[PDB]
mmCIF file of C-alpha atoms and ligand atoms in Angstrom:
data_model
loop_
_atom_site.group_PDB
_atom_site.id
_atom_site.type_symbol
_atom_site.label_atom_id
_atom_site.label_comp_id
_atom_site.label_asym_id
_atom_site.label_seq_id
_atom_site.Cartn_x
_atom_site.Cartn_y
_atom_site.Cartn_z
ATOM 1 C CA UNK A 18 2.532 -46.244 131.066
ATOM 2 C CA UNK A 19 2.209 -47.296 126.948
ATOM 3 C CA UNK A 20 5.498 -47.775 125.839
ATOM 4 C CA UNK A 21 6.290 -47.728 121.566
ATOM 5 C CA UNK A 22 9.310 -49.554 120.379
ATOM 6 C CA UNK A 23 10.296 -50.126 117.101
ATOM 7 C CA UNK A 24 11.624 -53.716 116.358
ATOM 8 C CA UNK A 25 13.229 -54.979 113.525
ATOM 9 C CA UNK A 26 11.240 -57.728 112.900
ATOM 10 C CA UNK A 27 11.368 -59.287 109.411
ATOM 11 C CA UNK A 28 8.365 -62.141 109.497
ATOM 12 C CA UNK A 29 5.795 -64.263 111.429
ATOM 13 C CA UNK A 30 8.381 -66.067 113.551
ATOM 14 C CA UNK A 31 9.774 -62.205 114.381
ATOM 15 C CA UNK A 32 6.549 -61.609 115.348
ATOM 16 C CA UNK A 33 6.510 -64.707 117.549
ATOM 17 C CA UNK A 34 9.568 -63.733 119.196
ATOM 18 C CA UNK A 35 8.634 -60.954 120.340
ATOM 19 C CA UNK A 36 5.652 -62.504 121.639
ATOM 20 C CA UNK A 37 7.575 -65.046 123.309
ATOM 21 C CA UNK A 38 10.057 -62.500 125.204
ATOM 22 C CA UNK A 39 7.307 -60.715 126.180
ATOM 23 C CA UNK A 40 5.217 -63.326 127.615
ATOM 24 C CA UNK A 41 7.987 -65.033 129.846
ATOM 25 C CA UNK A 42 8.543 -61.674 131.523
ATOM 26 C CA UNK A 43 4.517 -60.962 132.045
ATOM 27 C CA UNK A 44 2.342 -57.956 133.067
ATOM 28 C CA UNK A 45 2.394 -56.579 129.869
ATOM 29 C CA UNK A 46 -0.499 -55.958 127.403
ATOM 30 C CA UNK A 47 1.256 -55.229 124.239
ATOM 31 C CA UNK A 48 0.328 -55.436 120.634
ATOM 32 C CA UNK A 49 2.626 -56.187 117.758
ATOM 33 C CA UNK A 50 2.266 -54.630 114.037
ATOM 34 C CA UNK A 51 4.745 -56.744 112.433
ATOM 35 C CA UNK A 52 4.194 -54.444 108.783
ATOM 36 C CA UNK A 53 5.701 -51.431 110.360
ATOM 37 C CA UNK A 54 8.077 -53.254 112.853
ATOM 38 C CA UNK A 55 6.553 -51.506 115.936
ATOM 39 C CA UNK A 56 5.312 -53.053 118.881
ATOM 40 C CA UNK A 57 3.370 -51.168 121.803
ATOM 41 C CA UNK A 58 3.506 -52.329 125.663
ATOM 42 C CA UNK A 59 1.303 -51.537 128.565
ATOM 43 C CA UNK A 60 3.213 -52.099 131.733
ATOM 44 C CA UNK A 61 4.983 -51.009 135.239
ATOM 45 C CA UNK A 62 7.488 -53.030 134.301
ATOM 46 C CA UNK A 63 10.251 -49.648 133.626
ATOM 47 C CA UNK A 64 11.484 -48.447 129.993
ATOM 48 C CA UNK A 65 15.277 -50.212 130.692
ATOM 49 C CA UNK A 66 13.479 -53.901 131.607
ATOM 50 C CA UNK A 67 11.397 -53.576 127.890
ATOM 51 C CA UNK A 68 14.296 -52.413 125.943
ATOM 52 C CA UNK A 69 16.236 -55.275 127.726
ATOM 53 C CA UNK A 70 13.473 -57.617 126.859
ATOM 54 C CA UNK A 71 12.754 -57.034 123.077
ATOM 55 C CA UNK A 72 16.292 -56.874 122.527
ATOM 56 C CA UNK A 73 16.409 -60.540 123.836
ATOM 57 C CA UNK A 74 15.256 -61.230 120.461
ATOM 58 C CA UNK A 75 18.600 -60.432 118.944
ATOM 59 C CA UNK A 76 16.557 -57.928 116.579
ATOM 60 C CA UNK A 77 17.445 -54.191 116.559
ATOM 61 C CA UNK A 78 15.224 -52.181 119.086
ATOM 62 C CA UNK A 79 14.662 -48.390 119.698
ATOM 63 C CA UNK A 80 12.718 -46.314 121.245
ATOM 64 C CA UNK A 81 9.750 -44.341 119.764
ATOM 65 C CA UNK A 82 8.058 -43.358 123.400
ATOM 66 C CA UNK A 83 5.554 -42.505 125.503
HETATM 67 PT PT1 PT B 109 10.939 -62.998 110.356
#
């Protein structure tokens, strides 16, 4: 499924952050657009391991959906 999260990310190393969380927990194919603080994942992994994942962040996460 293509998950949509927002993500309150402020600059480039928010950006990065993201990147980072989402990288260490792997087979996703996500793309970040840091402007409008939303970030978009392609994955099995479920909805509750993402959520758990971006929030690893520390930034404020919701869900915008399928
Ligand atoms: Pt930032």
């Amino acid at each position: 499924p293509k998950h949509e999260f927002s993500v309150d990310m402020t600059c480039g190393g928010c950006a990065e952050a993201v990147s980072r969380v989402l990288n260490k927990l792997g087979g996703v194919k996500y793309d970040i657009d840091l402007p409008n603080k939303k970030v978009c994942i392609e994955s099995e992994h479920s909805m509750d391991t993402l959520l758990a994942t971006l929030k690893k962040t520390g930034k404020t996460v919701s869900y915008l959906g399928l």
